[PDB]
Design a binder for these strands. Structure first.
Ligand SMILES: c1ccc2c(c1)cc1ccc3cccc4ccc2c1c34
Lengths: 323, 289
DNA sequence: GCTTGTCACGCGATGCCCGAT
DNA sequence: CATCGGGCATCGCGTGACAAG
């Protein structure tokens, strides 16, 4: 042997002693490198130091064993109800903490994100914005960014959080800095899915097939209890639908018409439809409309390529429907 | 340049930066332990402190603390069948000014506004099975708008022990909602019924009266109107029905989002079913003055 | 078949310890 | 009370083996 190897071996022994103590599963620790071992040790220490100041059950009146068990996982229950992940970032743009669920949204391992620069995860076009959120002086924050997604590739996410002092960081003795405690959440079969609906002569629906109940979301009864079909139509398409209804009254066939229908979610769905008149003893009896749902891009393309220029043609809004 | 020498120097710089990172982390360690010397002693003291401190990185209470410090809110776990409150966090007291006794042994329908009860059912019957909505919760009875976001989970949860003589032992619910609740010169077109209820609202309303379409949809327009103008507005809506196709202009005052009165000119006409000539709804164009 | 990075090693320049001046 | 040379320990540098991707 030689003194250099013995010093390096003492250093590696202390590094392995640090590594075995980290609060991570053994399969995660065994795949770590010395540098990230030290980094995660520092991170655990700083987190414990902050919680040793900022931190510290079910109201005894309502305490049962099962309620205590639920209370012991309250934190994970909250993390799962988040629909996103937690992110605490220092003034130095370092990730003080990121919850495990970041892997379920971005693909990054919690062990690789902590104590790293947050800008490594932020898009280059949005980083500046983030910085202005890190620094006339109220506290609450809410904004939008785009973060790298390895499952995609980027993902736009809404950050809702606050600026609070990150105590117990022993900087040099400096006073504590202002860290961002934020919650990051995401943002909000068409190949021949043709469905047919039967209507009265005033376009009151009366019948609908399975794929129609799947597209629109109404039970066959719920579809007919809400009046005529003009209650289902976007206000930007009501006049086109009325025009094509007049056309079908005149000639028996409406022709292809693209318009928006209100679902049971109070959402809009583009449909390309064709209404035909059915006759009994030479008189009109009911209507048979054949619809094929459309993507948003195709719908807006048909809208910008419209032949008829009518009022409200370019309006966008929301609606509700009652019986 | 020379590929070999360039690669050699790049590699040397990589290793040098690695060494600098290691010494910096060791200095952070010495800053982060009780009393702190050379690298080996700092590492030994770090091992000792981490031993005394100590699988999740944070404890459950630390994670809950981080989330509640980030964006407030309180957790509740209800049953999908009856809405029976299975669990509610103590954070309900700082959020709704309500003790845990009010929610336990109760049902979420009993805690919300009656007008939202039906809405609640739509969110409980039967990406993941996420849920998110907005309701009004209790606190004379006072109510607050609460945004809820959660998920559908199979019951009972694994890990939690359920004794024989526990209240949950007889309920036998299969699915539960686990959620967090948190407190929170232009014109626009709209469609009402013949009573004045907003059934369609243009998105421009925010730039016109400060309200989102959800705050308008379902409500009557007369509720936003000034009492000295309410009968004028009502008679406008009544006369526009008798004169189908004809336009009717009416000026009134509108309670903006900031509880401020604006002057609005509304032009209303009626939409006729092109077959039965019946009144489908009333189209209004509401403009700022 | 190349890139980036992890780890061990050899190698001196100082560091600390400590009899011996 | 220092000051001084021993021998080992600490520590920063560059380089080569080796492997994940
Ligand atoms: C559910 C509810 C309403 C309608 C619908 C489905 C399908 C339609 C297909 C063509 C069509 C053409 C002219 C006017 C219409 C008015 C209402 C509806 C349709 C129309």
């Amino acid at each position: 042997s030689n003194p250099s190897k013995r010093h390096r071996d003492r250093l590696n022994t202390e590094l392995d002693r640090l590594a075995s103590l980290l609060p991570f599963p053994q399969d995660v620790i065994n795949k770590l490198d010395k540098l990230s071992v030290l980094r995660l040790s520092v991170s655990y220490l700083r987190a414990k130091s902050f919680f040793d100041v900022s931190l510290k059950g079910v109201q005894d009146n309502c305490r049962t064993k099962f309620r205590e068990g639920l209370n012991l996982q309250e934190g994970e229950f909250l993390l799962q109800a988040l629909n996103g992940f937690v992110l605490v970032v220092t003034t130095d743009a370092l990730v003080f903490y990121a919850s495990s669920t970041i892997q379920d949204y971005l693909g990054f391992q919690q062990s690789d994100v902590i104590h790293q620069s947050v800008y490594e995860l932020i898009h280059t076009e949005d980083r500046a914005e983030f910085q202005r959120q890190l620094h006339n002086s109220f506290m609450e924050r809410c904004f939008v960014c785009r973060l790298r997604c390895l499952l995609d590739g980027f993902l736009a996410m809404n950050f809702q959080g606050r600026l609070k002092y990150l105590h117990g960081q022993n900087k040099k003795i400096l006073p504590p800095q202002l860290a961002l405690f934020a919650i990051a959440t995401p943002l909000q079969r068409t190949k021949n899915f043709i469905f047919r609906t039967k209507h009265k002569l005033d376009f009151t629906p009366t019948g609908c097939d399975a794929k129609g109940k799947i597209v629109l979301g109404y039970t066959e009864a719920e579809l007919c209890m809400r009046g005529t079909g003009y209650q289902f139509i976007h206000a930007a398409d009501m006049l086109y639908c009325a025009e094509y209804h007049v056309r079908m009254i005149k000639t028996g066939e409406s022709g292809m018409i693209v318009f928006r229908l209100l679902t049971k979610d109070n959402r809009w769905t583009w449909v390309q439809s064709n209404a035909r008149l059915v006759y009994k003893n030479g008189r009109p009896d009911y209507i048979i409309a054949t619809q094929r749902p459309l993507t948003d891009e195709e719908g807006k393309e048909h809208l910008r390529k419209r032949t008829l220029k009518l009022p409200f043609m370019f309006a966008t809004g929301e609606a509700v429907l009652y019986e | 340049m020379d590929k070999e020498r360039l690669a050699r120097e790049n590699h040397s710089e990589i290793e040098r930066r690695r060494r600098n990172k290691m010494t910096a982390y060791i200095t952070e360690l010495s800053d982060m332990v009780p009393t702190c010397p050379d690298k080996l002693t700092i590492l030994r003291m770090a091992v000792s402190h981490m031993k005394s401190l100590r699988p999740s990185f944070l404890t459950d209470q630390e994670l809950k603390h981080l989330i509640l410090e980030a964006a407030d809110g309180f957790l509740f776990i209800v049953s999908c069948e009856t809405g029976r409150v299975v669990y509610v966090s103590d954070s309900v007291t700082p959020v709704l000014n309500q003790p845990q006794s009010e929610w336990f042994g109760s049902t979420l329908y009993d805690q919300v506004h009656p007008d939202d009860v039906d809405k609640l059912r739509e969110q409980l019957s039967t990406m993941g099975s996420r849920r998110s909505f907005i309701c009004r919760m209790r606190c004379e009875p006072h109510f607050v708008v609460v945004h809820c976001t959660g998920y559908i989970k199979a019951w009972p949860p694994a890990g939690v022990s359920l004794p024989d003589d526990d209240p949950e032992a007889g309920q036998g619910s299969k699915f539960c909602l686990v959620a967090i609740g948190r407190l929170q010169p232009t014109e626009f077109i709209s469609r009402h019924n013949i009573e004045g209820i907003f059934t369609f609202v243009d998105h421009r309303c925010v730039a016109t009266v400060g309200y989102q379409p959800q705050e308008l949809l379902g409500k009557n327009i007369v509720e936003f109107c000034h009492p000295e103008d309410q009968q004028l507005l009502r008679d406008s809506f009544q006369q526009v029905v008798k004169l189908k196709g004809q336009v009717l202009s009416v000026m009134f005052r509108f309670r903006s989002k900031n509880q401020e009165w604006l002057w609005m000119r509304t032009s209303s006409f009626t939409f006729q079913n092109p077959y039965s000539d019946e009144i489908e709804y009333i189209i209004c164009t509401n403009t700022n003055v």
